[PDB]
Amino acid sequence: ADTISRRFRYDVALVSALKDLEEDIMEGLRERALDDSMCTSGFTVVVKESCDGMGDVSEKHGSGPAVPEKAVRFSFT
Amino acid sequence: NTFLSCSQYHKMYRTVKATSGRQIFQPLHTLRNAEKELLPGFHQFEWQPALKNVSTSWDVGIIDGLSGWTVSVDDVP
Amino acid sequence: TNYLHKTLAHVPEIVERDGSIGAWASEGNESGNKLFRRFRKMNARQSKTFELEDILKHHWLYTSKYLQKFMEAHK
Amino acid sequence: FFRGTGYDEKMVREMEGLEASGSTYICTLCDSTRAEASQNMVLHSITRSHDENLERYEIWRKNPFSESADELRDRVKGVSAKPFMETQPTLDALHCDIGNATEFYKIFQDEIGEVYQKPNPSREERRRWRSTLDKQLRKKMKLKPVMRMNGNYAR
DNA sequence: GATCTGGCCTGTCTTA
DNA sequence: CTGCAGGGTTTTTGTTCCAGTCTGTAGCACTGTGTAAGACAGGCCAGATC
DNA sequence: CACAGTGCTACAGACTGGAACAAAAACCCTGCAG
Numbered sequence: 001a002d003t004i005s006r007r008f009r010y011d012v013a014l015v016s017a018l019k020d021l022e023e024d025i026m027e028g029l030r031e032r033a034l035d036d037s038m039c040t041s042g043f044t045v046v047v048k049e050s051c052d053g054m055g056d057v058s059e060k061h062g063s064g065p066a067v068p069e070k071a072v073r074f075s076f077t
Numbered sequence: 078n079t080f081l082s083c084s085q086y087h088k089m090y091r092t093v094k095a096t097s098g099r100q101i102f103q104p105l106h107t108l109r110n111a112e113k114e115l116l117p118g119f120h121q122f123e124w125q126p127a128l129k130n131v132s133t134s135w136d137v138g139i140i141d142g143l144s145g146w147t148v149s150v151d152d153v154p
Numbered sequence: 155t156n157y158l159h160k161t162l163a164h165v166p167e168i169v170e171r172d173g174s175i176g177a178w179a180s181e182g183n184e185s186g187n188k189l190f191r192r193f194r195k196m197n198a199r200q201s202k203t204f205e206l207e208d209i210l211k212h213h214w215l216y217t218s219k220y221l222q223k224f225m226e227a228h229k
Numbered sequence: 230f231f232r233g234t235g236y237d238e239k240m241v242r243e244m245e246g247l248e249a250s251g252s253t254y255i256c257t258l259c260d261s262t263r264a265e266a267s268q269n270m271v272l273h274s275i276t277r278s279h280d281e282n283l284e285r286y287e288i289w290r291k292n293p294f295s296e297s298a299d300e301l302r303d304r305v306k307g308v309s310a311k312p313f314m315e316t317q318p319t320l321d322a323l324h325c326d327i328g329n330a331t332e333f334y335k336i337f338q339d340e341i342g343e344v345y346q347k348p349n350p351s352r353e354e355r356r357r358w359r360s361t362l363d364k365q366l367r368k369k370m371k372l373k374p375v376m377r378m379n380g381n382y383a384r
Numbered sequence: 385g386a387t388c389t390g391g392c393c394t395g396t397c398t399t400a
Numbered sequence: 401c402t403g404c405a406g407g408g409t410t411t412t413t414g415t416t417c418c419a420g421t422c423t424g425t426a427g428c429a430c431t432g433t434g435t436a437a438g439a440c441a442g443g444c445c446a447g448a449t450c
Numbered sequence: 451c452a453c454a455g456t457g458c459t460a461c462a463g464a465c466t467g468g469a470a471c472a473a474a475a476a477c478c479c480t481g482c483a484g
């Protein structure tokens with residue numbers, strides 16, 4: 001295991017990014033003049049995901065273990 | 078002394094003033110007015126005896142280093 | 155070249171199917187890479203162990219909408 | 230609903246089992262070969278998908294008809310590795326613009342000199358043509374050359 | 385010694 | 401007594417313009433995140449074989 | 451038809467000042483009303 005990596009679990013990061021946008025979905029329900037309480041079971045969220053690498057990320061002295069320099073960054077929106 | 082860009086500082090200024098202010102920081106154009114005292118070319122001085130082949134005007138700010146190159150094409154560029 | 159084949163053959167099909175193209179472009183990821191460098195000099199603890207953890211956290215705090223609403227300052 | 234569209238071509242090819250990146254089978258969305266899409270350019274229909282590539286890797290590994298390496302590679306239109314990530318069949322915008330601008334930069338570099346009269350130009354002549362094209366593109370349009378071409382140069 | 389073919393090597397092409 | 405219309409009353413709330421004085425955004429030209437090996441076609445030579 | 455900046459310069463709107471005006475908000479005050 002020569003890899004140092006970190007990640008949020010998918011479901012948890014998704015429910016936090018969706019619970020953050022709650023202001024805008026409520027305001028859209030208001031402007032659209034649709035009832036807030038009713039018909040709340042059929043939502044649909046379309047999510048763009050992206051993955052990319054990045055060259056020459058300089059290494060640190062540190063303790064261990066040895067790691068390559070290139071990094072990979074998986075993100076979504 | 079905190080590496081705050083001018084535009085980031087104006088962003089912070091608008092933010093702290095608009096919400097619950099009572100602004101504390103000063104606007105940009107009054108910071109820029111307290112500047113001309115720190116840069117060179119503001120205080121008077123006198124060299125005794127007069128300096129050799131150096132102008133005696135004491136208000137020169139940032140000068141271009143080329144120092145009067147005769148840009149004409151035929152010479153060194 | 156491959157991109158010439160894609161831009162001369164499969165453009166109408168994907169614009170009709172997805173509805174749009176370029177709104178799903180990779181530009182939205184690459185730009186973020188810029189952050190990854192500023193967040194590795196300014197705001198990341200200088201240790202091999204905690205570096206990824208603190209970069210991930212500071213990036214997720216910069217990307218949230220809830221603090222951007224405050225930062226809009228209502229014009 | 231998840232839509233994977235942010236990957237460039239290198240990563241889409243290597244994470245779907247294709248061969249990167251100057252293969253004979255050019256399209257990620259279609260099955261046309263490099264020489265075939267030279268004759269015929271504008272008529273093609275999107276075929277490739279995830280499940281079809283899984284099934285085609287299965288054909289390539291099981292090999293039920295016992296073909297040689299080249300024929301079997303032709304039957305699965307170049308699927309020699311099992312795909313693990315799923316990728317929606319779309320086109321990246323940014324790297325498409327960069328690739329097309331590098332193609333037109335080679336066309337201009339060709340047109341400075343005369344390549345359709347003299348079909349075999351020397352290496353020094355290539356260097357001289359690129360140098361004078363960059364000199365001109367510095368005098369007007371206010372551009373300075375780049376080793377690898379970012380997107381701002383393309384726009 | 386004459387013959388041959390597999391594979392070694394080299395230059396261009398493609399997305400990065 | 402009440403009801404509503406319409407009288408006056410003060411006090412907003414803003415009404416016209418030209419000296420200014422100050423504040424906040426627009427115009428300028430340009431940034432940086434896009435960063436590696438692999439496929440293929442042709443020439444040829446070296447070692448194996450008859 | 452990326453996009454959030456990158457600072458300096460320029461000029462747009464927010465101010466006063468009396469003159470004077472109207473419209474309005476709302477008390478109170480009279481007429482004509484059962």
Ligand SMILES: [Ca+2]
Nearest residue numbers: 053054239400
């Ligand atoms: Ca890459």
Ligand SMILES: [Ca+2]
Nearest residue numbers: 052053237239
């Ligand atoms: Ca990449």
Ligand SMILES: [Zn+2]
Nearest residue numbers: 256258259273
């Ligand atoms: Zn195709």
